[PDB]
Each structure stands twice: as C-alpha cells, then as structure tokens.
Design an enzyme around this catalytic site. Sequence first.
Site, PDB file in Angstrom:
ATOM      1  N   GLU A  60       0.788  -1.298   0.185  1.00  0.00           N
ATOM      2  CA  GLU A  60      -0.368   0.284  -0.030  1.00  0.00           C
ATOM      3  C   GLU A  60       1.157   1.474  -0.183  1.00  0.00           C
ATOM      4  O   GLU A  60       0.741   2.496  -0.423  1.00  0.00           O
ATOM      5  CB  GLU A  60      -0.631  -0.044   1.638  1.00  0.00           C
ATOM      6  CG  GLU A  60      -2.199  -1.234   1.342  1.00  0.00           C
ATOM      7  CD  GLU A  60      -2.313  -0.769  -0.173  1.00  0.00           C
ATOM      8  OE1 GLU A  60      -3.760   0.256   0.097  1.00  0.00           O
ATOM      9  OE2 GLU A  60      -3.103  -2.071  -0.574  1.00  0.00           O
ATOM     10  N   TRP A 104       2.054   1.873  -3.435  1.00  0.00           N
ATOM     11  CA  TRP A 104       1.332   2.571  -4.106  1.00  0.00           C
ATOM     12  C   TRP A 104       1.131   3.966  -3.797  1.00  0.00           C
ATOM     13  O   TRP A 104       0.922   4.451  -4.750  1.00  0.00           O
ATOM     14  CB  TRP A 104      -0.342   2.022  -4.060  1.00  0.00           C
ATOM     15  CG  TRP A 104      -0.682   1.843  -5.043  1.00  0.00           C
ATOM     16  CD1 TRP A 104      -0.973   2.128  -6.448  1.00  0.00           C
ATOM     17  CD2 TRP A 104      -2.314   1.482  -4.993  1.00  0.00           C
ATOM     18  NE1 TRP A 104      -1.982   2.145  -7.332  1.00  0.00           N
ATOM     19  CE2 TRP A 104      -3.144   1.647  -6.390  1.00  0.00           C
ATOM     20  CE3 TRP A 104      -3.451   1.151  -3.424  1.00  0.00           C
ATOM     21  CZ2 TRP A 104      -4.560   0.852  -6.546  1.00  0.00           C
ATOM     22  CZ3 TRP A 104      -4.833   0.875  -4.576  1.00  0.00           C
ATOM     23  CH2 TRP A 104      -4.652   1.019  -5.446  1.00  0.00           C
ATOM     24  N   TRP A 137     -18.634  15.000 -20.601  1.00  0.00           N
ATOM     25  CA  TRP A 137     -19.792  15.948 -19.009  1.00  0.00           C
ATOM     26  C   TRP A 137     -20.933  16.169 -19.160  1.00  0.00           C
ATOM     27  O   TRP A 137     -20.837  17.164 -19.544  1.00  0.00           O
ATOM     28  CB  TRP A 137     -18.499  16.441 -17.942  1.00  0.00           C
ATOM     29  CG  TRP A 137     -16.600  15.286 -17.710  1.00  0.00           C
ATOM     30  CD1 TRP A 137     -15.810  16.079 -18.462  1.00  0.00           C
ATOM     31  CD2 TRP A 137     -17.217  13.791 -17.321  1.00  0.00           C
ATOM     32  NE1 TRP A 137     -15.023  14.965 -17.786  1.00  0.00           N
ATOM     33  CE2 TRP A 137     -14.875  13.517 -17.589  1.00  0.00           C
ATOM     34  CE3 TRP A 137     -17.836  12.967 -16.807  1.00  0.00           C
ATOM     35  CZ2 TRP A 137     -15.244  12.741 -17.186  1.00  0.00           C
ATOM     36  CZ3 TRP A 137     -17.181  11.752 -16.301  1.00  0.00           C
ATOM     37  CH2 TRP A 137     -15.266  10.887 -16.234  1.00  0.00           C
ATOM     38  N   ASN A 178     -11.409   3.530   2.201  1.00  0.00           N
ATOM     39  CA  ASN A 178     -10.768   3.364   0.661  1.00  0.00           C
ATOM     40  C   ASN A 178     -11.818   2.626  -0.441  1.00  0.00           C
ATOM     41  O   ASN A 178     -12.077   3.284  -1.012  1.00  0.00           O
ATOM     42  CB  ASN A 178      -9.509   1.736   0.862  1.00  0.00           C
ATOM     43  CG  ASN A 178      -8.787   2.218  -0.904  1.00  0.00           C
ATOM     44  OD1 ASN A 178      -8.756   1.252  -1.437  1.00  0.00           O
ATOM     45  ND2 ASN A 178      -8.806   3.812  -1.709  1.00  0.00           N
ATOM     46  N   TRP A 208     -15.058  14.342 -13.537  1.00  0.00           N
ATOM     47  CA  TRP A 208     -14.834  13.841 -11.781  1.00  0.00           C
ATOM     48  C   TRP A 208     -13.584  14.960 -10.675  1.00  0.00           C
ATOM     49  O   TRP A 208     -13.516  14.918  -9.694  1.00  0.00           O
ATOM     50  CB  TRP A 208     -13.639  12.597 -11.647  1.00  0.00           C
ATOM     51  CG  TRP A 208     -12.382  12.484 -12.586  1.00  0.00           C
ATOM     52  CD1 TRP A 208     -12.551  11.985 -13.297  1.00  0.00           C
ATOM     53  CD2 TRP A 208     -11.328  13.537 -12.055  1.00  0.00           C
ATOM     54  NE1 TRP A 208     -11.687  12.317 -14.067  1.00  0.00           N
ATOM     55  CE2 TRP A 208     -10.237  12.555 -13.576  1.00  0.00           C
ATOM     56  CE3 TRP A 208     -10.734  13.702 -11.471  1.00  0.00           C
ATOM     57  CZ2 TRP A 208      -9.128  13.400 -13.740  1.00  0.00           C
ATOM     58  CZ3 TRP A 208      -9.794  14.245 -11.517  1.00  0.00           C
ATOM     59  CH2 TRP A 208      -8.272  14.434 -12.818  1.00  0.00           C
ATOM     60  N   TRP A 244      -8.683   9.850  -8.334  1.00  0.00           N
ATOM     61  CA  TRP A 244      -9.870  10.385  -9.071  1.00  0.00           C
ATOM     62  C   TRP A 244      -9.738   9.900 -10.512  1.00  0.00           C
ATOM     63  O   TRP A 244     -10.632   9.388 -11.192  1.00  0.00           O
ATOM     64  CB  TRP A 244     -10.381  11.503  -9.212  1.00  0.00           C
ATOM     65  CG  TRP A 244     -10.876  12.026  -7.816  1.00  0.00           C
ATOM     66  CD1 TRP A 244     -10.991  11.948  -6.189  1.00  0.00           C
ATOM     67  CD2 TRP A 244     -12.561  11.876  -7.326  1.00  0.00           C
ATOM     68  NE1 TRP A 244     -11.924  12.309  -5.678  1.00  0.00           N
ATOM     69  CE2 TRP A 244     -12.581  11.928  -6.571  1.00  0.00           C
ATOM     70  CE3 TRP A 244     -13.574  11.170  -8.170  1.00  0.00           C
ATOM     71  CZ2 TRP A 244     -14.052  11.587  -5.428  1.00  0.00           C
ATOM     72  CZ3 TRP A 244     -15.057  11.333  -8.312  1.00  0.00           C
ATOM     73  CH2 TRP A 244     -14.814  11.327  -6.502  1.00  0.00           C
TER      74      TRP A 244
END
Length: 474
Positions: free
Chosen positions: A282, A285, A313, A348, A366, A389
């Site tokens: 993690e 990442w 959008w 998460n 977004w 995102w």
Amino acid sequence: AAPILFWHRRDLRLSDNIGLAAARAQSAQLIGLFCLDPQILQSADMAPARVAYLQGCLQELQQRYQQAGSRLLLLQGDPQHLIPQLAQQLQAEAVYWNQDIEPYGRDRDGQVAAALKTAGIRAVQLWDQLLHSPDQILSGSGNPYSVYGPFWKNWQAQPKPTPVATPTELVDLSPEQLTAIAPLLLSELPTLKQLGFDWDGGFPVEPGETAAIARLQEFCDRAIADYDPQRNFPAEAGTSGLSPALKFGAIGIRQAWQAASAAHALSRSDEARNSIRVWQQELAWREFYQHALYHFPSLADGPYRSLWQQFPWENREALFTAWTQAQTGYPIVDAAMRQLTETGWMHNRCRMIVASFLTKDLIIDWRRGEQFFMQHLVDGDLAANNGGWQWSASSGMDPKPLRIFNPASQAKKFDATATYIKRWLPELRHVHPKDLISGEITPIERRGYPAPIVNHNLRQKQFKALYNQLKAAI
Ligand SMILES: Cc1cc2nc3c(=O)[nH]c(=O)nc-3n(C[C@H](O)[C@H](O)[C@H](O)COP(=O)(O)OP(=O)(O)OC[C@H]3O[C@@H](n4cnc5c(N)ncnc54)[C@H](O)[C@@H]3O)c2cc1C
C-alpha cells in the site's frame, strides 16, 4: 551565532526526519519554523478537518522543540518573503527543509531557495516523505513509470532506508536574536477558531507525532496480521487510520516501513506474512502516485489521457449536490458520503464506490469530486486524491479497460450484511439488508430517505454510449 533554521511543512515531527537530522549534524543551534501560508490556509480547497489535525500536530511540535532545547518559530504570510527575511535577520548559516512533490510546493521552494542564495544563505532541500525519491526509481531507459507493475518490481528490489535519529540537546535563540526577528513572528499558535475554522467530527488517529507512533505500533502488533482481507470491508476497522499522519508527517515513512518489516519477521504465520506484505505494498502504491505527480505535474490539471480531456461530461449540478449531501438514494453511496462529511475520512473501498458513482452514474466531471474530497478529507492529498479520481475513469496513470461499478454489486460484495450502511444511515436501520444493498426500498419503509436520483441501468448505457461515440469520432 550560526543558527540553522529547519522549515517544517508536511513533516510535523522531530523523529525520523531526514532534513532535520541532516541539519542537526551541522549545528546544535537548530531552530524549527512553520509558516502559515495564506495561499494554503485561505484556499477554497482547504478542509476544516485537515486544519484541525494540522493545528494539533503543531501544538505538539512546539512542545517537542521546547523539550529538545530550542523552539518552533511561527510565521504568517508569504514564504518567499518571510523566510529569507527571517533567515537574514538571524544571520542563518542555512535553512533546511524536506522536498515537496506538488506543483505549488515545488514552485514556492525554488523561489525561496533563490531568495536565500541572493541573500548569500545556504538552502538544503532533502527527500524525506518517500522511501525512494522520484529520481531513484526510473526504467532501463531512465524514464518514469506510468504503469504500476514495472514500478512495483523496481521499487520492491531497492534497498530500504532505516529511521534516522531524533535531534537532541539543541541550543535555543538568545534575547538579542529574538529581538531581531520579533516583527516576523506570531506570539502564539492560533487556535482553530481564531483561524476561522470549526471541526468536531473527530479523527482516524488523534493529532500529533506521539499518537501517530502509538497507532503504528498498535496496528503492527495485531490488526496488520489480518489486513488481508479485512482491508476490503468498510464495516470492519481493518486499516491503520494513519493516512492523515502520513500526509502531515506525524509519522515518518521509514518508521512505518520498519515497524511493518519487524512485524513480518516476528510473524510465524503464512497468512499474517501475506497481510503484512499487502500493507507494505500500500505504501508502494502511495509512492507510485507521488512519483507520478512529481514526474507528470499536469496530472493535477485533470484528465490526463487525450480521450478523456474531450469526454462530454453532462455536469448536472443538481446531481452533484445530491451526491455531496448524501441524498443520492443509493445506500452504500450515501452512507459513505455521510462518513466523509461527518468524520473527515472514508474507507478506501467506499472512496472507490462513490468516485465511480459520481463519474460513471452521475456523469459529472470528476474534478468536482476531487475538489469535494479535498474540501473534506483530513488526509486530503493531491497525489493520492488525484490518483484516486483519475482511476475512476482510467483517465490518468495505469489505465484499465472501461468499466462501471454497480453500487448494488459492490455493496453486496463488501458490505454483505449492510452493517456499514446502517451504521452511517441509522434512519434506515429498520430496513432489510437485502433492500439496502439492492437500493430498492419501499416508499413507506423509506420514510424521509430519498429515492434513487438516477436509474443506474440508464446511466450506464448513457455513459458507454458517450464513450463509444467519442471513441469513434477520434
Ligand atoms: C477517489 C479516491 C480518493 C482518495 N483520496 C486520498 C486522499 O486525499 N489522501 C490519501 O492519503 N489517500 C487517498 N486515497 C487513497 C486511500 O483510500 C487512503 O490512503 C485510505 O483510505 C487511508 O486509510 P488508512 O490510513 O487506514 O489506509 P491503510 O489501508 O492503512 O494504508 C496505509 C497507507 O497507505 C497509503 N495508501 C493506501 N491506499 C492507497 C492508495 N490507494 N493510494 C495512495 N496511498 C494509499 C496511505 O498513506 C495509507 O495511510 C484515495 C483513494 C480513492 C479511490
């Protein structure tokens, strides 16, 4: 005499601090400093929970410096003006600080360094918040990674750094030095209220270096052993809750890696071994997205890939508002948005669900969501938030084939008993888990809880249609 100033920003701790330890090896007259930068504090993207946590970490840092032998100077204003001025008034031998990965922090830093050079004062910028700096992890061709797989393989093989020493026996400033800088200093640390903020929703881990170190130790002593698969369920408290501690540096990245590494060596169980390796990844990442932001700053501007910069959008404001207010009608989504606005943190798995919903179902740029998260997350972090995102649309790094989450599938898979949903939506505690998961709640048994603001199936066909149409038009 020859004092060295250490400028704190996202490293609010005295322990395991690269730049601070380097500074202490050069001088005992080490004076810490923090600058309340109006461009950061007054931003519309500042979260009240983040200021509360921040302010709390600073209160402790003031004490740590006092105990160490010196103090933490507090400043309010523009950094490239106030810091060089302070260093000059103090005839500083040097100003130390740990490097940033964000566009704003890096531009500001280059400007502060240049101002310091002009004044003839040394500026030392070292890497601290990453186990490996962006320049250490490059491909065979000497280029950054935009795909996780190859990045992980390189990162994983790199030798890991260990925690550095906590500076001790510092020499405080004298009255004459204090007189020289008096005009640039705040007499005391402003309270949350004085700064114009209010927060009463709590934190994933109490503010401060001490609380952060205690949580790291408590997590690695037990819960980490079950990280996999407990990490997947929002109802379960299976994660560390250290996110804000890592964003503001209440905990050092090397202390975290070491604590996990020591737990792995101590463990004699295979499953526990796996769980710890998963937690460690993690952290890998986290570095992937931070290095990505560093290498490709335009990521912060929005959709990275060409196709997505053109996506049509729909942007129905009413749909967005409903999302931000947890009035979407989709239990798993509203329960998550409520957890966010109420506690300043979101599991998460839920961040993934609500992000996908906003982008795929509501079809809203977004960026509106990225901004809403930054306006509420106690751990609001550009690299991770933007990474999260861009992910909801595969519009950035490490892209994957087009896919759309079905709130119902996710809810059933990760909250099968609807424990997390009823927890954050207590007004629906009477409804059957089956109905809260499918999102099909009878009007009478729904009370004041709103009906779905969109028909998932129709929204899904609409999104794919827009995707394929633009896909072809290119
Ligand atoms: C849409 C979306 C927005 C997000 N917003 C942020 C944000 O603003 N700030 C934040 O730090 N993280 C963000 N995340 C990543 C993530 O969800 C959190 O780091 C996590 O919820 C933190 O809880 P924890 O500390 O218990 O994590 P743990 O599971 O205990 O993980 C340990 C540490 O690893 C890091 N981490 C874990 N998952 C990731 C990941 N997906 N990306 C980057 N770092 C990760 C965090 O520093 C975390 O504290 C986002 C993810 C998504 C999908």
